[PDB]
């Protein structure tokens, strides 16, 4: 009754928790972990498609465009909510991939991925640091779904731009529910938008990591599943060559 109505719909359409189905039983090797991660990733991109089909405005873009923006955000979405969920249930002090897959410091001993898990870990730190609320989270995550377009833009640019705007303004709502300044509320906005502007670069490291484990998978002994494989082949190279338009909040 103080929660703006979209922010309650955001609540409700949020997915239920996805397990990794991870054997836990026997001792992690670095291929098995990598493989669970993926299976877990598969189950999360199904959940993103479902999620997108109820989010107000997503389905009145052109099919294509809806396919392009998911293909283009799924890493950045995955990473974000590992943030979120790490921050919410383990104090940002452990990486909460899933209920059945939680990584403490021990566990990323075997590197490959030690270094990368450091970098994933930045996000739940910044959330702890910023004391990010649920409402602001719901709104910035839609923002990352709308964060990057083709260099030639979208088929439904205009609706796009409308939808982006109407969720930038939903975030100024949420920011509003607690930062009652006009000074503070501003700086907060600034801060919640640099935070997003910042996960580009962090993402381009997952990205480059995910393609080279892709490509060396057979060497590596790492199974990628089908849905995950297709978005990687489809967009990752192109993304990684910087043949996409990052939307910036700041200059
Ligand atoms: C192992 C790897 O191929 C590279 C980085 C891994 C990513 C990191 C982002 C991530 C966090 C989640 O909440 C979903 C599982 C998850 C992944 C599963 C597979 C990936 C994409």
How many beta carbons lie within 10 A of that of residue 170, not counting itself? 23
Give the Cα separation of 205 and 79 in Å (integer).
11
CA distance to 185, 206, 251, per residue, from 18 (Å)? 34, 20, 37
Give the Cα separation of 84 and 138 in Å (integer).
10
Q: Dihedral of the CA atoms 104, 105, 109, 114 (nearest 10)?
A: 90
Resolution value (Å, 1 decimal): 2.8
φ, ψ for residue 13, nearest 5 deg:
-90, -15
CA distance to 12, 71, 159, 234, 238, per residue, from 195 (Å)? 25, 21, 25, 27, 24
Give the Cα separation of 86 and 234 in Å (integer).
30
φ, ψ for residue 65, nearest 5 deg:
-45, -45
Judge whether 88 and 132 are in contact, CB under 8 Å.
no
Which among 77, 101, 74, 75 has a CA at the least distance from the CA of 89? 101
> Ligand 1 centre from 44 Cα, in Å?
9
> Ligand 1 centre from 111 Cα, in Å?
15
* DSSP β-ladder status, 245-246 and 148-149: antiparallel
Within 13 A of 185's CA, how many CA atoms are on the CB side? 13
Domain formed by 1-251, architecture: Orthogonal Bundle (1.10)
The total number of residues shown for the chain amounts to 251
Structure-solving method: X-ray
- Sign for the CA dihedral angle at 29, 31, 37, 40 comes to negative
Q: What are the binding residues for progesterone?
A: 85
Judge whether 126 and 195 are in contact, CB under 8 Å.
yes
Give the Cα separation of 96 and 117 in Å (integer).
11
How many beta carbons lie within 10 A of that of residue 190, not counting itself? 12
Residue 101 forms beta bridges with which residues? 98
| Residue 91 backbone zone (phi > 0: left; psi -120 to 50: alpha; other: beta) | left
Q: Which atom of ligand 1 is found nearest the CA of 37?
A: 18
Contacts of 96 (CB under 8 A, 6+ apart): 82, 85, 86, 88, 89, 90, 102
Q: Which atom of ligand 1 is found nearest the CA of 209?
A: 4
Which among 54, 126, 47 has a CA at the least distance from the CA of 83? 126
Which among 233, 239, 234, 231 has a CA at the least distance from the CA of 207? 239
Cα 238 to the center of its chain, rounded Å: 19
Give the Cα separation of 232 and 212 in Å (integer).
11
Is 49 in a helix, a strand, or coil? helix
Pocket around ligand 1: residues whose beta carbon is below 6 Å from it? 34, 37-38, 40-41, 44, 78-79, 81-82, 97, 206, 209-210, 213
Q: Two tokens at 23?
A: 């054997």
Is 236 in a helix, a strand, or coil? helix
3-class secondary structure per residue, 165-227: HHHHHHHHHHHCCCCCCCCHHHHHHHHHHHHHHHHHHHHHHHHHHHHHHHHCHHHHCCCCCHH
Is 102 in a helix, a strand, or coil? strand
Angle in degrees, 0-180, between the axes of helices 30-53 and 63-89, rounded to the nearest 10: 120
- Sign for the CA dihedral angle at 126, 31, 103, 232 comes to positive
How many beta carbons lie within 10 A of that of residue 158, not counting itself? 9
Domain-by-domain residue ranges, the chain? 1-251
Cα 75 to the center of its chain, rounded Å: 6
Contacts of 111 (CB under 8 A, 6+ apart): 30
Q: Which atom of ligand 1 is found nearest the CA of 213?
A: 3
Residue owning the nearest CA to atom 12 of ligand 1: 78
Give the Cα separation of 42 and 53 in Å (integer).
17
């Amino acid at each position: 009754q103080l929660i703006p109505p979209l922010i309650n719909l955001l609540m409700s359409i949020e997915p239920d928790v996805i397990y990794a189905g991870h054997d836990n039983t026997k001792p992690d090797t670095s291929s098995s972990l990598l493989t669970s991660l993926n299976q877990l990733g598969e189950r999360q991109l199904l959940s993103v498609v479902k999620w997108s089909k109820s989010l107000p405005g997503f389905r009145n873009l052109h099919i294509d465009d809806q396919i392009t923006l998911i293909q283009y955000s799924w890493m950045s979405l995955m990473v974000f909510g590992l943030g979120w969920r790490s921050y919410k249930h383990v104090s940002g002090q452990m990486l909460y991939f899933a209920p059945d897959l939680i990584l403490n410091e021990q566990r990323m001993k075997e590197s490959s991925f030690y270094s990368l898990c450091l970098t994933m870990w930045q996000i739940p730190q910044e959330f702890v640091k910023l004391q990010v609320s649920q409402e602001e989270f719901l709104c910035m995550k839609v923002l990352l779904l709308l964060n990057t377009i083709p260099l030639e833009g979208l088929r439904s640019q205009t609706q796009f731009e409308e939808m982006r705007s109407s969720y930038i303004r939903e975030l100024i709502k949420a920011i509003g529910l607690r930062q009652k300044g006009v000074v503070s509320s501003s700086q907060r906005f600034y801060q919640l938008t640099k935070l997003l502007d910042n996960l580009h670069d962090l993402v381009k490291q997952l990205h480059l990591y995910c393609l080279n484990t892709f490509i060396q998978s057979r060497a590596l002994s790492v199974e990628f599943p089908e849905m995950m494989s297709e978005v990687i082949a489809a967009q990752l190279p192109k993304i990684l060559a910087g043949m996409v338009k990052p939307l910036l909040f700041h200059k």
